[PDB]
Structure 1
Amino acid sequence: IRKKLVIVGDGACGKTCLLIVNSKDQFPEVYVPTVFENYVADIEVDGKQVELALWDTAGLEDYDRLRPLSYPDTDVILMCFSIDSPDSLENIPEKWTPEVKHFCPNVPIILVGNKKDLRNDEHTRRELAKMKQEPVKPEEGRDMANRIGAFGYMECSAKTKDGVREVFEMATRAALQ
């Protein structure tokens, strides 16, 4: 069983690290903004074996004109924001949802809060306090997930591996239905 997964979200919100930790168990430490990049990973959920094609996309302006090349034949979308960036959560309904719904009309969406490990982070409170921001709360994520009609809501941390498998198991179940 082959399914195509596409991941989208704001620049540097952790899309590639999530994909690489899932597929290779390695955490890429040095940031390299994505232009276009595909991976393959095998996974078994509910006793069913699936070959997941992982299509990675650019969040960054310089490179974001190709993004439509990744949308064809998609079975499931991972729509990402970072838990340390309410601005990135803000962008979900503004741009990401409309774009995805247009290019991927009836494809299920998993809303994913990345960088869970940064919710209790000295440094993040500081940056955000200056911005008046409060690190994203689970309820806020779930609420947006319900707002945008996502198949589900998940939180993870590529850095600690926490919640990663769960993200891709949910994505796969959505892709099977």
Structure 2
Amino acid sequence: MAAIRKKLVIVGDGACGKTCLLIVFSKDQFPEVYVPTVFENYVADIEVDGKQVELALWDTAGQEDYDRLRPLSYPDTDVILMCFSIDSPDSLENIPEKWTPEVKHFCPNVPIILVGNKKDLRNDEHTRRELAKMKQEPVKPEEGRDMANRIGAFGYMECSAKTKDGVREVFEMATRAALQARRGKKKSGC
């Protein structure tokens, strides 16, 4: 029954789908009415490569007025899911501006996985035309892919909390990366 427990923290601008992803991972039913700002942390038993593993999951408040409060949950962290929304090129822009500096500063040698939220919106008309209202299109998978490369993530995984597509897969990658163990401090010193 009992198992290895790995700590996982999820970061990203606000409006990117952090809380929803988590809800659906526990509850299994996408919020019908009301979305909490922050989901209470909890743990998920998940079975990966036929290994019983336990995953402590922390939602966060991505708004700037918590820039000081938020890092309280970084210590202990085994892996970081860094989120952006696929329907917001503005959130993807913020990845190497705000998120990875903060994370590479607070969790030096901790692996990251780039998580593109709300796939279901990539080919949704309303979305396509609201972005076009300001000369934008939804984020391309090949754009996200090299971001992951640019920030040096473990990998790039994309999903949709609403439709469930790829959510299961997202956390198995996280587990895979938590069970990884070879990093730092690059021979220094001496």
Please tell me whether the aligned partners of residues 17 and 28 of structure 1 are also in contact (alpha carbons under 8 angstroms): yes
Aligned to 1:41: 44
Larger Rg: 2
Task: Give deviations 1:109-168, integer Å, cap 9, x for gaps.
Answer: 000100000001111112211221110010001010101000000010000000000000
Please tell me whether the aligned partners of residues 20 and 35 of structure 2 are also in contact (alpha carbons under 8 angstroms): no
**In structure 1, what is the Cα distance between the partners aligned to 2:38 and 2:26?**
19
Task: Give deviations 1:45-81, integer Å, cap 9, x for gaps.
Answer: 0111111000110122344431011111000000000
Larger relative helix fraction? 1
**In structure 1, what is the Cα distance between the partners aligned to 2:32 and 2:92?**
23
The structure-2 alpha-carbon separation of the partners of 1:35 and 1:19, relative to structure 1 and needing over 3 Å to count, comes to closer
Question: What TM-score, normalized to structure 2?
Answer: 0.89
Percent sequence identity over matched residues? 99
SS of residue paired to 1:80: strand
Deviates more, 1:6-15 or 1:18-27: 18-27
Please tell me whether the aligned partners of residues 81 and 113 of structure 1 are also in contact (alpha carbons under 8 angstroms): yes
Question: What TM-score, normalized to structure 1?
Answer: 0.95
Unaligned runs of 5+ in 1: none
Unaligned runs of 5+ in 2: 181-190
Cα distance, 1:98 vs structure 2:
0.3
Larger relative strand fraction? 1
Cα distance, 1:37 vs structure 2:
3.0
Please tell me whether the aligned partners of residues 33 and 60 of structure 1 are also in contact (alpha carbons under 8 angstroms): no
Runs of 4+ aligned residues of structure 1 deviating over 6 Å after TM superposition are none
The structure-2 alpha-carbon separation of the partners of 1:43 and 1:20, relative to structure 1 and needing over 3 Å to count, comes to same
Cα distance, 1:43 vs structure 2:
0.3
SS of residue paired to 2:94: helix
Deviates more, 1:144-153 or 1:25-34: 25-34
Please tell me whether the aligned partners of residues 109 and 150 of structure 1 are also in contact (alpha carbons under 8 angstroms): yes
RMSD value, Cα: 1.4
The structure-2 alpha-carbon separation of the partners of 1:65 and 1:35, relative to structure 1 and needing over 3 Å to count, comes to farther
**In structure 2, what is the Cα distance between the partners aligned to 1:36 and 1:61?**
18
Task: Give deviations 1:83-103, integer Å, cap 9, x for gaps.
Answer: 000000000001100000111
SS of residue paired to 2:46: strand
